[PDB]
């Protein structure tokens, strides 16, 4: 019958994930994603492994920066819950679209 | 044969238009005389024939076990000749597909061809030795004598009319021979570069006149006229009508053929799978084409009376014609779709004006 007040697990996971560094997305689905969208530019390529790790690091850093600027937007609108008009606002302001 | 009122600014091929996603593992391609069929060899030794007007697969004939790498049509369109690593002089029918000739003769063959008027005389180009001309009934074989015997790579063919036999070694020396008596009437070494010679890969001809092509190995396609060879005669020194190359990517070629009217030249890469089209007369590139960006090109065809081009890559045979644009006034010719304010006053016979067959044509003619 013991359950937390909602939000506590959220904040402790925030601290638990900021106190560590690792690859965060599971590696083989991301590798299959990279090969599948590299199909369209030159058929039957041959990657190395370190290039795939470099892509995973670049994409992970880009998503983390995007979500922090999204969270700034959502706190600015006197809300807490992130809605995708925040993300579209952030990529409209930053200049990528 | 087709519509005569169709020519609303006809074009020269631009689009992709859709391919034959039916049977892969294609190896070579060639059309018949009019441009109505297309034989295509498989990988295991079969024949794929595709009809054009119905856009339908005509006939599948299983020849042998060795892969089919050389094909040609007869003049009537009834005798297919072919040869492969099977070493066999073959001859096939189009209504039945019968093994009419079977003579396993060594040094496997790289190219066959009929004489363009008599289908009795057929061309045989061995693996090493000099090219051979044969008959149909008996084994009368004519090996053309070569002074070199050192390349063991000699190319030869018949031209449009079958008047002569243009021969070529892999040193770039040409020996013109008469088509029946083997008269060495003309000879020339190709003026390659500054001085140093090159090999000869293949030689093809036209459908109208005597302009033809030389496919060397120094990445330079050369265009000559056969009447200039005839005007020279022996110890000729021809300089070409037009030279062809692409030094941006320095691309050696794999296959060439002419247009139907002898006006345009297509030639294909061995590296990029990207087709180029040239003008014969004025002498420049007109259009680059593309495709699947990382495939290896094998064989390129052309359709004579209609701008259709066949490619071969990864066993897939493309067909490229305009993705043509349809409009109104074929459903209703009394109405024409304009664009802007068109004025109608030029005729003067308006405002209530009132003024004051015998051809017998056959119905079952040709």
Curated annotation (Swiss-Prot), chain B:
Stretches for region Disordered: 343-363
Annotated phenotype, changing residue 361 to E: Significant reduction in its ability to stimulate KMT2A methyltransferase activity in association with WDR5 and ASH2L
Region annotation Interaction with WDR5: where it falls in the sequence: 357-366
Main location, first listed in the record: nucleus
Keywords for the protein's UniProt record, in alphabetical order: Chromatin regulator, Isopeptide bond, Nucleus, Phosphoprotein, Repeat, Transcription, Transcription regulation, Ubl conjugation, WD repeat
Tissue-specificity statement: Ubiquitously expressed.
Subcellular location field: Nucleus
Compositionally biased region (Acidic residues): 343-356
Location in chain, cross-link Glycyl lysine isopeptide (Lys-Gly) (interchain with G-Cter in SUMO2): 128
Modified residues (Phosphothreonine): 251
Modified residues (Phosphoserine): 349
A GO BP entry: response to estrogen
Intervals holding WD repeats: 21-62, 63-102, 147-187, 195-234, 248-290, 292-330
GO terms for MF: histone binding; transcription cis-regulatory region binding
Segments of this protein annotated with the region Interaction with ASH2L: 329-356
A GO term from the CC aspect: MLL1 complex
Subunit record text: Component of the SET1 complex, at least composed of the catalytic subunit (SETD1A or SETD1B), WDR5, WDR82, RBBP5, ASH2L/ASH2, CXXC1/CFP1, HCFC1 and DPY30. Core component of several methyltransferase-containing complexes including MLL1/MLL, MLL2/3 (also named ASCOM complex) and MLL4/WBP7.
Functional note: In embryonic stem (ES) cells, plays a crucial role in the differentiation potential, particularly along the neural lineage, regulating gene induction and H3 'Lys-4' methylation at key developmental loci, including that mediated by retinoic acid. Does not affect ES cell self-renewal. Component or associated component of some histone methyltransferase complexes which regulates transcription through recruitment of those complexes to gene promoters. As part of the MLL1/MLL complex, involved in mono-, di- and trimethylation at 'Lys-4' of histone H3.
Protein's recorded name: Retinoblastoma-binding protein 5
Organism: Homo sapiens (Human)
Whole-protein coverage range: 2 to 380 of 538
